[PDB]
Design a protein around this ligand. Structure first.
Ligand code: CLA
Ligand code: CLA
Ligand code: CLA
Ligand code: CLA
Ligand code: CLA
Ligand code: CLA
Ligand code: CLA
Ligand SMILES: CC(=O)O[C@H]1CC(C)(C)C(=C=C/C(C)=C/C=C/C(C)=C/C=C/C=C(C)/C=C/C=C(\C)C(=O)C[C@@]23O[C@]2(C)C[C@@H](O)CC3(C)C)[C@](C)(O)C1
Ligand SMILES: CC(=O)O[C@H]1CC(C)(C)C(=C=C/C(C)=C/C=C/C(C)=C/C=C/C=C(C)/C=C/C=C(\C)C(=O)C[C@@]23O[C@]2(C)C[C@@H](O)CC3(C)C)[C@](C)(O)C1
Ligand code: KC1
Ligand SMILES: CC1=C(/C=C/C(C)=C/C=C/C(C)=C/C=C/C=C(C)/C=C/C=C(C)/C=C/C2=C(C)CCCC2(C)C)C(C)(C)CCC1
Lengths: 172, 214, 161, 169, 144
């Protein structure tokens, strides 16, 4: 049923070990696709906002009026308590306001789950149908690989000193 | 697992044991033997091995004892020894009023205060070593029969020896014999656990060596 | 696949598969499972044997260490002494991929014994069960002795010694 | 699911029901394990019902003896580690009862005539005559056992958190 | 079970099919060695072979040499690997000059065949390039 879709490719093939798709309709799957993409779209950006801070490139000046600085705040989970409280309240209300209104398919004319384009074509018909299925799988596989990356970066920074468990070998 | 299981040739999935009604009855148990309530939760009667092999090895000739038969013969001997041993352990301790001891200084109270130290004390002396030889003669003269019954050449019941010197049972109806036989078994069973009690307590850290051993 | 791959089905639990990890799966993902299981057992059987010999005292080349979680993972040098070993197992894996892309191949038959036996000689089926049943007992046993040393200090026998 | 009773009208607090409760499908996958599953579910429920009241009564009663007392042990959560001479002993006698259960487990399934969980244990005589009341009777044991499995997991975990008396509040 | 049968179901042929002769390890291994690999120009067949031999022939000359304990221990022996390769190549030239016969008809549909005079010459020259180059490669790898 769902064995020939975007998301199925070598080496593993159709990889359903637990068996969630043995009793899935179209509606059951379309929820699984729509959000595994969404989990990946967070994690791919969670790689980008994260590497550039541990490499040291920080925003110029102080953060606010009252004088907290971008360079003082550490990378990882320990930097969440150095940001002010009202600074965290602006970020969460942003990503709240994001998903409530503008990450949304309001016209109902989405071609697939994960489509937020809302009927304003950006050159997607420029892509041929094979090139369409290529780019949709690259986002997903980088989505799936970044999830295990950030889950790496969160667990290794809690256990060890730096998150970069792979840069730890052969000299940091 | 694809052979025919061994649980079927020795478990009889039609009836249930009187003792433990949730288990099915072992195949060799019946109501035939005295003192039987179908009690075999570990299915020991059902082991298809020849336990006469211990006396004579199976490579001597074709031969086979029933497993149930060898068990009854054991249980009677375990009963008889324990009925005398529990009784003899207390009687030399003075649990029946009189401290019953053999004549002579060596078996008196001063050399052996209670029965608990009679095994180690008599073993050094030799009286223990002598009784080992005296039992040895009887066992050898009475354990050869197990072989005969295992060759099918005898119709003797388990634990049956023509030992009735006072003629308790000559001419008794099989109902009378079976009831008497059940008494050998029920009193023997209680005395197997009585001796296991007395020998255990009397050997822990506390525990006296008086008639009551608690 | 369950009815054609009888190897592994024994008396304690004829085809023990609770949780339905095996229920309604294609051959290719099933054949992966058997080839994974056989590989895990083989490594664990060789690890158990290699751990007991280093534990018992006989550790021959340079006379370094008795406890063998120190010997390997803090102590043995990362740059060469681990690089080569993993490289040497990598050439065996590469060789086994050439083994797997041939006709008439079993899930775990590197030696290619199916060229002399069709799996219907019970002695062959029976002996194979010996390898895989042991392989299974070795996977749990290596995990038991690894947790025993990762957490405690004792790395030898806790049951008999 | 058919024949073997147990799924009945009790609304779950998420908007689903227990009219046929098998989310991950243990009935359709390996149904040969179904007599082992019921037999497991029972023994987990029977021991949890006894251990629930087993936490009730050692607050106010305390059977005569110096070894366990309020002055000896105030916190009944600590009766486990501070009476180990009684702990191995209860463990030893349960092993005699669990050992006579093996041959019933060895033919659990179609080979032996008995239904799982069903000891021939009725001294008092309270299991009724006909199916209408008997299936209702077996069903009341299931829910009371399941209510008691989740109960003591909340009672014992509560006492480590709160460290208080019997309703924990 | 039997793990030994007549090779290619020919009982009278003088060969035995054992796990040392025809097992899955020895089949896939030998089929991927350059003297038996499908899809190789006879130059390439000789190149690879030479690339793998000149590299280890280095070792016993540099270590157990007559000048092994000198400041020119690496030079002494490298030169003597080249002299060993010159003798081996010389055995390859003469072998093919006598085993194979020149072709009359320009007819040549298999230019890939190794067991011919033209290809053996290419196979011989590839051995000499790969063995002198691998002798020079670990001259760099040991100079460290
Ligand atoms: C270990 C205890 C146990 C066992 C063996 C069973 C066994 C069974 N239950 Mg049951 N149940 C239990 C506890 C248990 N129950 C509890 C506590 C509740 C209350 C929530 C229920 C409520 C319940 C309902 C409402 C129904 C069943 C039904 C069934 C039967 C079919 C389902 C099945 O095969 O899955 C059981 C198979 C298992 C392998 C047991 C599951 C054990 C899992 C794998 C443990 C994993 C962790 C778990 C989620 C606990 C979370 C705690 C923490 C780790 C997060 C089967 C006889 C159905 C029935 O009667 O069918 C006729 C039915 O309708 N159960
Ligand atoms: C890598 C380990 C591994 C793998 C891949 C397998 C795979 C397999 N086993 Mg198997 N097995 C294992 C370990 C493994 N087993 C161990 C350690 C035991 C001893 C209990 C067994 C006992 C066993 C029996 C008796 C039988 C099989 C069978 C099978 C096959 C069918 C069942 C199935 O599809 O499960 C797929 C398995 C997996 C996808 C991997 C398991 C996933 C694990 C990680 C879940 C949790 C692990 C565990 C709970 C960790 C806690 C314990 C401890 C190690 C930490 C399948 C090829 C059956 C067979 O041979 O059919 C022909 C069969 O009858 N197995
Ligand atoms: C997972 C398997 C495993 C791993 C990772 C190691 C790792 C280690 N062992 Mg060890 N060992 C193993 C299994 C393993 N051992 C087994 C099964 C034995 C019994 C023969 C030994 C016997 C042993 C001794 C006595 C010593 C070590 C030592 C060592 C260290 C140096 C490597 C060495 O000299 O090995 C030596 C042994 C081998 C290289 C053989 C193991 C590999 C087997 C499976 C051979 C299979 C190869 C392959 C299948 C066949 C291809 C070639 C063949 C056809 C000719 C290193 C930490 C030393 C050490 O660190 O002590 C503290 C040491 O003194 N090994
Ligand atoms: C998951 C995303 C994520 C999260 C939670 C963080 C978290 C953090 N970053 Mg970081 N960062 C990330 C992604 C992330 N980063 C990316 C994407 C980049 C580069 C553009 C950086 C570059 C960066 C710098 C240069 C600095 C931080 C800093 C910080 C800290 C303070 C917050 C701040 O000023 O944000 C700064 C956020 C940005 C500069 C860019 C945010 C970009 C977001 C993720 C885009 C997603 C929403 C977007 C509108 C989606 C577009 C959809 C479109 C189709 C409409 C905090 C620990 C500061 C600090 O103290 O360092 C420790 C600091 O100086 N970050
Ligand atoms: C255009 C409207 C607007 C306005 C007027 C402000 C105004 C303010 N923001 Mg801001 N902010 C905005 C849009 C805006 N923001 C947007 C779109 C974002 C992206 C999510 C943020 C993200 C943001 C962060 C992350 C922080 C502020 C903070 C602040 C305040 C400085 C606090 C201080 O020093 O008090 C004395 C200031 C009142 C800072 C704050 O509240 O720190 C206490 C702070 O850290 N803002
Ligand atoms: C299981 C039975 C049993 C055993 C093994 C013993 C063993 C012992 N008793 Mg004892 N006793 C028993 C029953 C037993 N008693 C009974 C039932 C009584 C009371 C009637 C006594 C009364 C008694 C006294 C009064 C004394 C002992 C003493 C002793 C000790 C030394 C005796 C000695 O060396 O043998 C010497 C005795 C003999 C060699 C007698 C012959 C025994 C024959 C050979 C046994 C075979 C016949 C037997 C009845 C079976 C018949 C055949 C069978 C097929 C039916 C020794 C510890 C002495 C001691 O140290 O006290 C502390 C002591 O003074 N016993
Ligand atoms: C069940 C099989 C088995 C296995 C896998 C091992 C495995 C091991 N034993 Mg062990 N051992 C066993 C049976 C076994 N033993 C038995 C039956 C005895 C006799 C009671 C011993 C007595 C024994 C001693 C006395 C010692 C070991 C030691 C060892 C280690 C080397 C290794 C962990 C040695 C050890 O732990 O070295 C650190 C050690 O000193 N064992
Ligand atoms: C003189 C004077 O006045 O100057 C002072 C003023 C003042 C105010 C003091 C100053 C300051 C500090 C400022 C302005 C600091 C600003 C900080 C800022 C602006 C920080 C943004 C973070 C954005 C994040 C984390 C985005 C996360 C985005 C996330 C987590 C997502 O993944 C979004 C996701 O959406 C996708 C893509 C798709 C959806 O399907 C799923 C979701 C929704 C999950 C200065 C600079 O010092 C200057
Ligand atoms: C014009 C405008 O205004 O907007 C446009 C801008 C633009 C650019 C066109 C846009 C776009 C598309 C974008 C931005 C797409 C971005 C995609 C992105 C950023 C995809 C990352 C994947 C990362 C992965 C898979 C990492 C895995 C990493 C893993 C698994 C690791 O191993 C981590 C590892 O760390 C450990 C644990 C240890 C170390 O030993 C080793 C390393 C470090 C390796 C938008 C959205 O259209 C908006
Ligand atoms: C706790 C005590 C217990 C013992 C001591 C015991 C021992 C033996 N079991 Mg057994 N057993 C259980 C309990 C016990 N089994 C349980 C709970 C199950 C269900 C999981 C179970 C399942 C099977 C199957 C499926 C088979 C089996 C057999 C034998 C066999 C003879 C071997 C021989 O001598 O060949 C012996 C000694 C096999 C048979 O009869 O044929 C080969 C066979 O298939 N069992
Ligand atoms: C012992 C053993 C074994 C074996 C092994 C071996 C035998 C190996 C070998 C190896 C080798 C034997 C290697 C080789 C290598 C080589 C090389 C690495 C080369 C290189 C080269 C180069 C790179 C090039 C050169 C050049 C040229 C040609 C031209 C000019 C320029 C140059 C110089 C650049 C086994 C596994 C069985 C098992 C275990 C044991």
């Amino acid at each position: 049923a769902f064995e020939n879709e975007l998301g199925v490719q070598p080496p593993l093939g159709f990889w359903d070990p637990l068996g969630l798709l043995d009793n899935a309709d179209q509606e059951r799957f379309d929820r699984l696709r729509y959000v595994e993409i969404k989990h990946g779209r967070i994690a791919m950006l969670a790689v980008l906002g994260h590497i550039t801070t541990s490499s040291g490139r920080t925003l110029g000046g102080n953060i606010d009026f009252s004088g907290t600085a971008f360079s003082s705040i550490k990378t990882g989970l320990a930097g969440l308590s150095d940001i002010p409280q009202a600074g965290l309240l602006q970020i969460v209300a942003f990503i709240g306001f994001l998903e409530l209104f503008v990450m949304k398919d309001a016209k109902g004319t989405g071609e697939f789950p994960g489509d937020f384009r809302n009927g304003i074509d950006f050159g997607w018909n420029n892509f041929s149908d094979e090139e369409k299925m290529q780019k949709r799988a690259i986002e997903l596989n980088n989505g799936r690989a970044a999830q295990m990356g950030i889950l790496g970066l969160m667990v290794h920074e809690k256990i060890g000193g730096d998150p970069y468990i792979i840069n730890e070998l052969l000299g940091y | 697992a694809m052979p025919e299981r061994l649980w079927d040739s020795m478990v009889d999935k039609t009836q249930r044991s009187k003792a433990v009604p949730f288990l099915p009855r072992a195949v060799n148990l019946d109501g035939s033997l005295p003192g039987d309530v179908g009690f075999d939760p570990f299915y020991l009667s059902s082991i298809p091995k020849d336990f006469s092999g211990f006396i004579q090895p199976p490579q001597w000739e074709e031969k086979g004892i029933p497993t149930l038969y060898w068990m009854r013969e054991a249980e009677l001997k375990h009963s008889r020894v324990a009925m005398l041993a529990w009784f003899g352990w207390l009687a030399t301790d003075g649990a029946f009023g009189v401290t019953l001891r053999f004549p002579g200084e060596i078996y008196s109270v001063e050399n052996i205060p209670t029965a608990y130290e009679a095994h180690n004390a008599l073993v050094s002396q030799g009286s223990m070593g002598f009784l080992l030889l005296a039992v040895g003669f009887i066992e050898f003269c009475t354990g050869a029969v197990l072989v005969e019954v295992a060759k099918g050449d005898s119709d003797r019941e388990a634990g049956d020896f023509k030992l009735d010197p006072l003629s308790f049972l000559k001419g008794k109806s099989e109902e009378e014999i079976k009831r008497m036989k059940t008494r050998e078994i029920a009193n023997g069973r209680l005395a197997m656990l009585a001796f296991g009690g007395v020998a255990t307590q009397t050997a822990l850290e506390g525990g006296n060596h008086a008639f009551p051993y608690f | 696949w369950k009815d054609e791959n009888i190897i592994g089905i024994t008396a304690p639990m004829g085809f023990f598969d609770p949780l339905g990890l095996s229920s309604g799966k294609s051959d290719e993902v099933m054949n992966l499972y058997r080839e994974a299981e056989l590989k895990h057992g083989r490594v664990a059987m060789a690890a158990c044997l290699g751990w007991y010999i280093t534990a018992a005292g006989v550790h021959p080349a340079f006379n370094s260490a008795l406890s063998s979680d120190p010997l390997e993972a803090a102590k043995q040098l990362p740059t060469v002494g681990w690089l080569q070993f993993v490289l040497g197992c990598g050439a065996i894996e590469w060789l086994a991929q050439q083994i797997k892309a041939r006709p008439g191949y079993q899930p775990g038959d590197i030696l290619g014994a199916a060229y002399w036996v069709d799996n219907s000689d019970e002695g062959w089926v029976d002996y194979q069960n010996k390898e895989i049943n042991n392989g299974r007992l070795a996977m749990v046993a290596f995990m038991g002795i690894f947790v025993q040393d990762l957490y405690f200090g004792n790395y030898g026998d806790q049951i008999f010694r | 699911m058919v024949g073997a009773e147990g799924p009945e009208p009790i609304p779950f607090a998420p908007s689903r029901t227990s009219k046929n409760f098998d989310p991950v499908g243990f009935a359709e996958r390996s149904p040969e394990w179904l007599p082992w599953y019921r037999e497991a579910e029972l023994k987990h429920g029977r021991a949890a019902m006894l251990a629930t009241v087993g936490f009730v009564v050692p607050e106010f009663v305390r059977i005569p003896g110096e070894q366990f007392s309020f002055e000896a042990i105030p916190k009944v959560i600590d009766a486990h580690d501070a009476l180990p001479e009684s702990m191995i002993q209860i463990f030893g006698w349960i092993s005699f009862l669990e050992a006579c259960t093996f041959p019933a487990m060895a033919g659990l399934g179609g080979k032996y005539d008995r239904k799982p969980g069903d000891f021939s244990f009725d001294p008092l005589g309270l299991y009724p005559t006909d199916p209408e009341k008997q299936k209702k009777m077996q069903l009341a044991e299931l829910k009371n056992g399941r209510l008691a499995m989740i109960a003591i997991g909340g009672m014992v975990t509560g006492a480590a958190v709160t460290g208080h008396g019997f309703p924990y509040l | 079970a039997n793990f030994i049968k007549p090779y290619n179901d020919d009982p009278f042929v003088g060969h035995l099919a054992t796990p040392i002769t025809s097992s899955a390890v020895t089949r896939s291994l030998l089929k991927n060695l350059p003297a038996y690999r499908f899809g190789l120009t006879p130059l390439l067949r000789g190149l690879e072979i030479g690339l793998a031999h000149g590299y280890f022939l280095i070792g016993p000359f540099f270590k157990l040499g007559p000048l092994r304990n000198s400041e020119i221990a690496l030079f002494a022996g490298f030169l003597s690997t080249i002299g060993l390769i010159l003798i081996l190549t010389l055995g390859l030239t003469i072998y093919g000059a006598v085993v194979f016969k020149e072709e009359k008809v320009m007819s040549s549909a298999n230019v890939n065949n190794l067991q011919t005079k033209k290809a053996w010459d290419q196979f011989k020259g590839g051995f000499f390039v790969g063995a002198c180059g691998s002798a020079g490669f670990a001259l760099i790898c040991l100079y460290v």
